[PDB]
Each structure stands twice: as structure tokens, then as C-alpha cells.
Amino acid sequence: SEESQAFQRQLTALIGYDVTDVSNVHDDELEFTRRGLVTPRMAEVASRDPKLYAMHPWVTSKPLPEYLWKKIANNCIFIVIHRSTTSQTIKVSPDDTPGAILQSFDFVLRVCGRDEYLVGETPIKNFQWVRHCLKNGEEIHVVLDTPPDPALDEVRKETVSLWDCDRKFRVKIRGIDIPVLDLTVFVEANIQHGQQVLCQRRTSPKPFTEEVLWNVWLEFSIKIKDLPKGALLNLQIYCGKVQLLYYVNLLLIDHRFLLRRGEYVLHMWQISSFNADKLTSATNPDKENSMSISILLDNPIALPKHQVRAEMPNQLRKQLEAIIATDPLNPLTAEDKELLWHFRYESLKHPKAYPKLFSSVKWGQQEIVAKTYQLLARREVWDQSALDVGLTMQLLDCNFSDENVRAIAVQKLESLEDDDVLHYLLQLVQAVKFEPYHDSALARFLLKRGLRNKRIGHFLFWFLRSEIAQSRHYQQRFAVILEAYLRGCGTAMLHDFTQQVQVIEMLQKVTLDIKSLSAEDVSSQVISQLKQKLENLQNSQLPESFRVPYDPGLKAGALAIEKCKVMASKKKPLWLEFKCADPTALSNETIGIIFKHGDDLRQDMLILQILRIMESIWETESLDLCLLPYGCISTGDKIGMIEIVKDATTIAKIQQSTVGNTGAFKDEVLNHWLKEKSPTEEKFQAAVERFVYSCAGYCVATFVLGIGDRHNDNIMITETGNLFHIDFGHIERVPFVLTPDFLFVMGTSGKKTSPHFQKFQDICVKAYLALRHHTNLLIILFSMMLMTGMPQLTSKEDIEYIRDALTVGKNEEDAKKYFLDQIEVCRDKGWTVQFNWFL
Ligand SMILES: Cc1c(-c2cccnc2)nc2cc(F)ccc2c1N1CC(C)(C)c2ccc(N3CCOCC3)cc21
Structure with a gap:
């Protein structure tokens, strides 16, 4: 092929990995799987509706919750429609379909500011965008647009049975070879199905030289016919009590149902129990540095x-x-x-x-x-x-x-x-x-x-x-x-993706490079170089616009260079702000993004995703707890992007502004910070209300996840009362954060019970018990989160936390008092843990 010369190279630039490369294989499964996936692709590519795919309407079929019906005004919602300059508002009933809004005078209603559409045979209340505008309390601004062309979505034209073998399984251990290294070493060959070990044999221990040869047939008690598809030959290396040093895997029954045979030279991974990486059929690509084992399978x-x-x-x-x-x-x-x-x-x-x-x-x-x-x-x-x-x-x-x-x-x-x-x-x-x-x-x-x-x-x-x-x-x-x-x-999205990757690799470099300039407290000189580079970048690299990876509705255009900075922080993250590329976007608010190296944001992604899940759980019970699970995409190795939440500061900086540093923490600060950010009493008390929900949400959520005990420059509040935790890529005690400052916003002090604090407990216990009505689901998400997101050799002990946290086996009455005990530990401790963090 001659236009695969671009396409494949383009795919590798977009994937970030050369798919065709066969330097790190010992069979043909990966290549097979490429071919095996063509059909399911062709099937979806061909069967999807061209136009609905182009407009990707984002819709749900859950009931519109109780909290949003109570916001409907006499079974009528208002929608503002825009032409050129002039626009007019139209009365609508939640059940109205977009088509039943079109004839109300071929075009299509696009949302103002976004690449989001309100099309399709679903009521307007069923589009998430509308549900969002009620949520926050905004007017629904749409634009009469011509539908995008599906031509842009065009896709470029592309001998003896096993249960008859009664012989016992066996694998020859030829030896191991480390290129560079005073103890002893042996090899443990496990036949594994799942985390379950079916059969296990060992070599005798040998001296640990840069080469060790055994030449031994490890004979197993399991028959060949007794091997189940998906069985793993798990070869492991211990030294000497013992210690596991290298592991590696090989499927015994391969991707064509054939029993694995012949000579294998597999490179092994090092160690730094339950951990997804321990199960991989992949071999270590680092040939020069890594240990390898040599084996033989034959019948x-x-x-x-x-x-x-x-x-x-x-x-x-x-x-x-x-x-x-x-x-x-x-x-x-x-x-x-x-x-x-x-x-x-x-x-x-x-x-x-x-x-x-x-x-x-x-x-x-x-x-x-x-x-x-x-x-x-x-x-x-x-x-x-x-x-x-x-x-x-x-x-x-x-x-x-x-x-x-x-x-x-x-x-x-x-x-x-x-x-x-x-x-x-x-x-x-x-x-x-x-x-x-x-x-x-x-x-x-x-x-x-x-x-x-x-x-x-x-x-x-x-x-x-x-x-x-x-x-x-x-x-x-x-x-x-x-x-x-x-x-x-x-093509459309391939072009989108291409743009997206370029932008974030431009910016990651400007993060990599800027970080290098600072001795650990922002330098005067670093402002010169940053603002230079961000101007020097916009000159001949950045496109007219790109999609915001954490919010694909939003196209970002030119940089707001003046508003870009680097935080007084030891990981020197970038604070970038972009103009919206959309002229129809009747905002003026920039799009704020943080770029940060030093943190593993895969852990943030995971926790944030769980929070979105807790939210929808609460939705099933008509609760809202106004969590703020801001967007966050991990893009590379300890590096990614984070949504800048508009009009928000940290609790600590509110303590640092009234009292100063060496936090002689005062209680009244938060309540009168809120007051001083509120214009009216109406918007103040709404903000106090938002805080009661926000706080309780994050109280319940953090305790269950066991990330409750937190230094409070990691808790943020918006100028509109919304409390929310941040920087999850971190992790005597305390269950969650409920300090005198929060409690005073509620209207309490030391030992009291305000009207709001009662509601706080009411909202807490409801939220906590709602989670418990999904114990099973949360347990599994948490397990899976530990195994695939937190490298820590994570044990049963780590996972058993959420059993206790969600008090399994306990009745509803008993757990309500368990959670209320938690609240009261926070009440009791006051400023102790907060103060203790300092050092
Ligand atoms: C809290 C804060 C703040 C901040 C903002 C307002 C008040 N006080 C501190 N500013 C930053 C500026 C930067 F350039 C980079 C990072 C921050 C920043 N951080 C520090 C850290 C740990 C990197 C972080 C992680 C997530 C966030 N978010 C803040 C934007 O809201 C969404 C998440 C902020 C920050």
C-alpha cells in the first residue's frame, strides 16, 4: 500500500505505540487480534446511523429526578433560540421532542458554545444538557444550525485432540540470565487459573550468578487434558526466608485453542500480591536491562x-x-x-x-x-x-x-x-x-x-x-x-484526535521544560520564559482550536497568555487559560486547564470516576449532593490535565488570608468569606445550602473510599458554596474532614445543633445508607480500582477497608449510629489533625 504509508504512521502518532512492531512477542496473538477485530469494526461502522453519529445526541432514559422536577415552573421550561444577532425565548413542556420544537414557527438545534446537539426522538428533558441547565439553574441557549455532514465521518476503505492426552504436564527450565547483577535463587512454575494456583513446582536452589542453568524437567500432577483455556504458566524467581524478584507469564493454551509448544526466551518484570500487572501475558520489552528465563514445552x-x-x-x-x-x-x-x-x-x-x-x-x-x-x-x-x-x-x-x-x-x-x-x-x-x-x-x-x-x-x-x-x-x-x-x-475524529494529541504534546514539553528552570517559590525569570514559550508556541504550532479532552463539547481556541502562570508548588504545574473557539459561545469565561508532572493522575481519574458513580446512585434515590468531580485526563507518565474549576479557592488559603501562616485557625473565617463573596442574602443562604450538601457528599464519599483524612489545601470551595476535594494522587487520624469552620457555616460551635447541622446529619445518613444499597457494586469498583490503579502490591487488608467503611452485615439502624459516631470524632478533634499536618 502507498496511502497506508501516511495512515499507519498517523495511527502510531495517535496511539503512542507502534502496533506493527514484533520485537516484543513470542507468538502471533497481537497480530491475530488486529485481524480478528476487523469484523466487529466493519459491523459497527456499517450499521450505525450516519447522521445520529455525526450529532451524537447525549441522552438518558432515567427519570428526571425529584430535585429537578421541583425546579420545573408550571410544567414549562424556557429555551432561547439564536439566529444572527436577534433571538427569542420559547415556552416548552418537558415532553417536547426537538422536532416538536422545530415546527414551532432542514435545520437542527445546536447548543450555544458547544459541539452538542439537541436532536432525536427523545423528549428535551432526556438530553443531559437540559438536565445540566436545571441542575445549576441556567437558561437553555440553543442555535439554529445546519446539521454537520456525515461525509466527514466517512471511514477510509480497508493433529491429535487435547482430551485424549493423559500425560502429565511438564516444562523444562533451561535457566535464567541477568545481564548485570550474593545469595541463592530458584524458579517457581505455577499453573494458574485466575488468581487461583492449580499446581506448583520448584527448581532446587542454585547460586545467583549472572547466568544460572538447571536443565530440569519440572513435572506437574495436573494432566494436559485437565488444562483449561486461559491457563497461565506463571514462572517466578525468588532469592535467599525468600523474596519474589521477577515474574513472567505464558498462556498454555494459545489464541487458536492450541497447546503451547517449543523453545521460549521470555523477558521478565521486576518488583517495585493483587495487582493487574502480575497477570499480564506481555513480556518485558527492556531486553538489555531485564532478567530472562529460558524454557521448553514439548509432547x-x-x-x-x-x-x-x-x-x-x-x-x-x-x-x-x-x-x-x-x-x-x-x-x-x-x-x-x-x-x-x-x-x-x-x-x-x-x-x-x-x-x-x-x-x-x-x-x-x-x-x-x-x-x-x-x-x-x-x-x-x-x-x-x-x-x-x-x-x-x-x-x-x-x-x-x-x-x-x-x-x-x-x-x-x-x-x-x-x-x-x-x-x-x-x-x-x-x-x-x-x-x-x-x-x-x-x-x-x-x-x-x-x-x-x-x-x-x-x-x-x-x-x-x-x-x-x-x-x-x-x-x-x-x-x-x-x-x-x-x-x-x-476522518472527522481522526482529525480531532490528531489536533488533540499535538496540542497536549506541545504543552507537556512546555511543562517538562519549565519545571527544569526552578529551584524548590516562583522565580521572576521563569515568568519571562513561560510567557515567552506560550507566545512562541501560538506563533507557529497551536491550531485555531482543539477539543478539550475532559469535555469534548468544548472547543478551545487562542491562549489567554496574560492569565497563564505556574503555581507556588513543588511540582510546578501550569495554569493555562484558553478563549473558547466558538463565536456562538455567549460566555466570556475562559477554559482553564492545569498541566502537571509529578503526580500519577490515573489514581485521580479512578477516584473521580467513582464519585460520578456515587452521584448517579444518589440520583436513583432523588438525592443530590453537589459533588464536584472536575475533569481530569491522564495523558502520559506521571503527567496530565485538570479542569480549572471557576471561582474556587482552597480552605487553607482562606485560613492564610484572614489569620496568616502558622495557622492559628479561626472558626468564623469561612462563613464570612462566603458572606464576602455573596452579593445578596438570597444568594448567600443558597450558598450555605450548597455547602451543606457539598460537605456531606464529600464527607460520605471520602470516608467510604478511605481518603477522608486530608490536609486542607486539598479541599476547595467555589464562591457559590460548593465544597470539593482535590489532588487525590497522594494516597493519629480522623474519618473525614469536618472542621469547626465548616460547622460554623452550618451554624454550630463546639457543642450545639443548628437547623442546618441537623440537615447535614440527615443528608449524611441518607447518603451513607444509599451507598450501602449498592455495597456489592462499590466493593467491586474499589477492589478493581486498587488492582488496576494503585501499584502497592495491594493486599486483602487494603481492600477489606471498604467492608468496614460500608459496615457490611450490619443493619440500617446500627450503621446510622456508626456514621454519626464518625461525625462526632471530627466534632471532638477540632483543629488537631489539621494543625498536626503542618510540620
Ligand atoms: C489548589 C491550586 C491552586 C489554587 C487556586 C486557587 C486558590 N488557591 C490555590 N492554584 C494552582 C495553580 C497552578 F498553576 C497549578 C495548581 C494549582 C493548584 N493545585 C495544586 C495541585 C495539587 C497541583 C492541584 C490539583 C488540582 C487542582 N484543582 C484546582 C482547579 O480545580 C480543579 C482541581 C488544583 C491544584
Whole structure:
């Protein structure tokens, strides 16, 4: 090809990884998966509606919450429509479709300021933009526009069976080789299914020289026929009690159902328990620095494909139901497992048993797996059950290495409306890390949902890009998936993405480079160089405009160079501000972005995403808690962008402005800072109200996530009362932050109970118990968040935190008093922890 000369090179610049490269493989799975994904791409590319894809209307089908109906004025909402200069307002009823607004005099209603549209056979109350304008209390400003051309979305034209082998499995350990290094070393070969170790053998310990040869056949007790698809040969290196130093993996049954054979020279990863990177089929690309193991597999041999009780004692049925009932983090004993397995079919009638049930399968037995597959072909009850994401997630996590088990989870995700895919996208993307193969139902599901929706597609991109840039363990796989998406998203977005990448690489350089200029307190000279470079950048590199990666509605244009700065901070982040590229954007507010190196923002992304989830949980119960989960995209290695939240300062700086440094903390400061930012009493008390919700939200949220105890230049408030935590990329005590200054805004002091503080407790306990009505879901998101986002060798102990936090097994009454105890610890401690942070 001759125009693939541009296209492929263009794809590599957009992906941030050369997909075609085969220097770091030992088989052809990645290349296979590229080819295997063409079909699911062609299928979505071809079946999606050209025009709806072009306008990507962002819509929901949940009920309009109680808090937003109470904001409707006599079943009528106002919409302002703009032509040239002149515009006029129109009365509308929540049920009005855009078409039923068009004939009210071919064009299309575009939102003012944004690349957001109000088109399609859904009521106007069902568009998120409208729901946003009610949320904050804004008028809906639209523009009579001609619909964008689908031609721009155009997509460029593109011999013996296994269950007959009764011989025991064995692998030759030839030896190991470190290029550069006084103890001893041995090799541990685990046959793994999920996190479960089926069989384990060791070499005898040898002296640890830069080369160690064993030449030994490690014979296993598991038969070849007893190997299940998705089994991992996990080779590990310990030294000497012992210590794990290098790990590496190899699928025993490969992507064409063939049993793995022959000579392998695999490069291994170092160490710096439950951790997604520990499961990777990827080899270490650093050939020169890293340790490698040499092995031999020999005996082709292929794995094939296949083609009742329900009357139990009382004591037994209950014991089963007690097991089904326990949380996702509860250990199943041998007794538990044997019980679930025997009552297989009774258990199948309970969708909630599924995780626990398929955790009872002895995957090291061919016949058992067969019975399991029999069982899965009988899933009417499952197939009929209403979607449960908490349940669906549990089956996609690290404890399930089975294509068919995982398929049934992805089956349920199929029914998510595009709104919920956005809510779970990040976590789903991360769950790809648990998939035993590069091609899987989960990867294809993300592929096609991404292709069907420019919004899911846009974030999909950034999420895969984020990992490709900083995970050697999973860049190859994500790269394959992203290339797949890119070859289907259509020229328009490829042009968008291209612009987006260029801009952020221009700016990352200006961050990299500026950071270097400062001895750790802003220099006078650094202002010269920054403002020079930002002018020197706008001259001949920055485009007329680019999409804001954390908000793809918003196009950013020229820089507000005058307003750009670098914080008095040790990580020297950039404070950039951009004019909106949209003339129709009847704002004047800039678009504010922070660029920061030094922090791992993948951790922020994860926590922020969880917060958006807690929000929608609250929505199901008609609660609003006015969390502020600001946009934040990680783009590379310890570097990314952060939404600047307009009119907001930190609690600490409010303490630093009235009292000064060495914080002799005063209580009245916040309340009269608020007062002094409020114009009227009306807008003041609304701001105090917003604070009661804001505070309680972040109280409940931070405690549950165990990130509650915080230094308070990490808590921010808007001039309109909105409290919100920031910089999550960090982590005697305190459950969450509820200081005398917050309490005084509520109207309390030391030991009292104002009208608002009662409401605070009321709102708290409601929020806390609402979360508990999704215990299972939060537990799994938290587990998954730890395993894929926080490198820490994260243990059971780390994860068991949220069990306690959400007081599992406890009744509603008992937990309400648990949470109220928490509040009272904060009441009791006052300024102690805050003061203690200082040093
Ligand atoms: C709090 C604050 C502030 C700040 C703003 C108002 C009052 N006091 C401090 N200014 C900054 C200016 C910069 F150029 C860079 C960073 C900050 C900054 N930080 C520090 C840090 C940890 C990098 C950070 C992380 C998130 C945020 N956000 C602030 C914008 O709101 C969304 C998130 C700010 C800051």
C-alpha cells in the first residue's frame, strides 16, 4: 500500500505505540487480534446511523429526578433560540421532542458554545444538557444550525485432540540470565487459573550468578487434558526466608485453542500480591536491562468445544442462601464451595450466586469444567434477570479467567444505554487487564460501543491512550484495541484526535521544560520564559482550536497568555487559560486547564470516576449532593490535565488570608468569606445550602473510599458554596474532614445543633445508607480500582477497608449510629489533625 504509508504512521502518532512492531512477542496473538477485530469494526461502522453519529445526541432514559422536577415552573421550561444577532425565548413542556420544537414557527438545534446537539426522538428533558441547565439553574441557549455532514465521518476503505492426552504436564527450565547483577535463587512454575494456583513446582536452589542453568524437567500432577483455556504458566524467581524478584507469564493454551509448544526466551518484570500487572501475558520489552528465563514445552494438540436437582433440606437451603447473601469480598471455605457446587442448579436460579458459584468450580478438572459449560447453556434466569452492574463487574475481575463466564457478563453490559457506558467506561477499560486474551467479548464490546457513539469513542481513546503511555504491561493490547477503534471512528475524529494529541504534546514539553528552570517559590525569570514559550508556541504550532479532552463539547481556541502562570508548588504545574473557539459561545469565561508532572493522575481519574458513580446512585434515590468531580485526563507518565474549576479557592488559603501562616485557625473565617463573596442574602443562604450538601457528599464519599483524612489545601470551595476535594494522587487520624469552620457555616460551635447541622446529619445518613444499597457494586469498583490503579502490591487488608467503611452485615439502624459516631470524632478533634499536618 502507498496511502497506508501516511495512515499507519498517523495511527502510531495517535496511539503512542507502534502496533506493527514484533520485537516484543513470542507468538502471533497481537497480530491475530488486529485481524480478528476487523469484523466487529466493519459491523459497527456499517450499521450505525450516519447522521445520529455525526450529532451524537447525549441522552438518558432515567427519570428526571425529584430535585429537578421541583425546579420545573408550571410544567414549562424556557429555551432561547439564536439566529444572527436577534433571538427569542420559547415556552416548552418537558415532553417536547426537538422536532416538536422545530415546527414551532432542514435545520437542527445546536447548543450555544458547544459541539452538542439537541436532536432525536427523545423528549428535551432526556438530553443531559437540559438536565445540566436545571441542575445549576441556567437558561437553555440553543442555535439554529445546519446539521454537520456525515461525509466527514466517512471511514477510509480497508493433529491429535487435547482430551485424549493423559500425560502429565511438564516444562523444562533451561535457566535464567541477568545481564548485570550474593545469595541463592530458584524458579517457581505455577499453573494458574485466575488468581487461583492449580499446581506448583520448584527448581532446587542454585547460586545467583549472572547466568544460572538447571536443565530440569519440572513435572506437574495436573494432566494436559485437565488444562483449561486461559491457563497461565506463571514462572517466578525468588532469592535467599525468600523474596519474589521477577515474574513472567505464558498462556498454555494459545489464541487458536492450541497447546503451547517449543523453545521460549521470555523477558521478565521486576518488583517495585493483587495487582493487574502480575497477570499480564506481555513480556518485558527492556531486553538489555531485564532478567530472562529460558524454557521448553514439548509432547499439534488442540482443545475442543462441547455439544439436575432442586429439592433440598431446610438447614441446607438456608446455609446456601446465607452464602449467596455475603459480600463479594467474603472468603468461601471448602465447605462453602462444595455446597454451591453440589447445589449447582438451585444456585443457578440466583443471579447473585454466579460469582460465588463459578468460584466453586475446580477448573483443573476437564469433566467439572464440562459440567460448568453444561450449566451455562441453561441460563434462562440469568438471561432474564434485570441488569446488575455490581454483579456484572464481579465476573469481569481478576478471579475469572474463563471466556464463557466472562462472556455472560459482557452479555449483560450489552443492554446498558450509552449513558451508563460512560459511567462505567473507565473501569471497563481497566477490566481489560484481567482478560486472559487480547481478543475478548469485553474488548469488542468497548470497540463497538465506542464506534457507535462519538462520546464513548472520544473517552475510550483517552482511556486507552492513558494506559498505552504508562503501562509496559498492557500497552500492546490496548494499542491493538485503540488501532481498531481508530480505523472506524471516521476522518472527522481522526482529525480531532490528531489536533488533540499535538496540542497536549506541545504543552507537556512546555511543562517538562519549565519545571527544569526552578529551584524548590516562583522565580521572576521563569515568568519571562513561560510567557515567552506560550507566545512562541501560538506563533507557529497551536491550531485555531482543539477539543478539550475532559469535555469534548468544548472547543478551545487562542491562549489567554496574560492569565497563564505556574503555581507556588513543588511540582510546578501550569495554569493555562484558553478563549473558547466558538463565536456562538455567549460566555466570556475562559477554559482553564492545569498541566502537571509529578503526580500519577490515573489514581485521580479512578477516584473521580467513582464519585460520578456515587452521584448517579444518589440520583436513583432523588438525592443530590453537589459533588464536584472536575475533569481530569491522564495523558502520559506521571503527567496530565485538570479542569480549572471557576471561582474556587482552597480552605487553607482562606485560613492564610484572614489569620496568616502558622495557622492559628479561626472558626468564623469561612462563613464570612462566603458572606464576602455573596452579593445578596438570597444568594448567600443558597450558598450555605450548597455547602451543606457539598460537605456531606464529600464527607460520605471520602470516608467510604478511605481518603477522608486530608490536609486542607486539598479541599476547595467555589464562591457559590460548593465544597470539593482535590489532588487525590497522594494516597493519629480522623474519618473525614469536618472542621469547626465548616460547622460554623452550618451554624454550630463546639457543642450545639443548628437547623442546618441537623440537615447535614440527615443528608449524611441518607447518603451513607444509599451507598450501602449498592455495597456489592462499590466493593467491586474499589477492589478493581486498587488492582488496576494503585501499584502497592495491594493486599486483602487494603481492600477489606471498604467492608468496614460500608459496615457490611450490619443493619440500617446500627450503621446510622456508626456514621454519626464518625461525625462526632471530627466534632471532638477540632483543629488537631489539621494543625498536626503542618510540620
Ligand atoms: C489548589 C491550586 C491552586 C489554587 C487556586 C486557587 C486558590 N488557591 C490555590 N492554584 C494552582 C495553580 C497552578 F498553576 C497549578 C495548581 C494549582 C493548584 N493545585 C495544586 C495541585 C495539587 C497541583 C492541584 C490539583 C488540582 C487542582 N484543582 C484546582 C482547579 O480545580 C480543579 C482541581 C488544583 C491544584
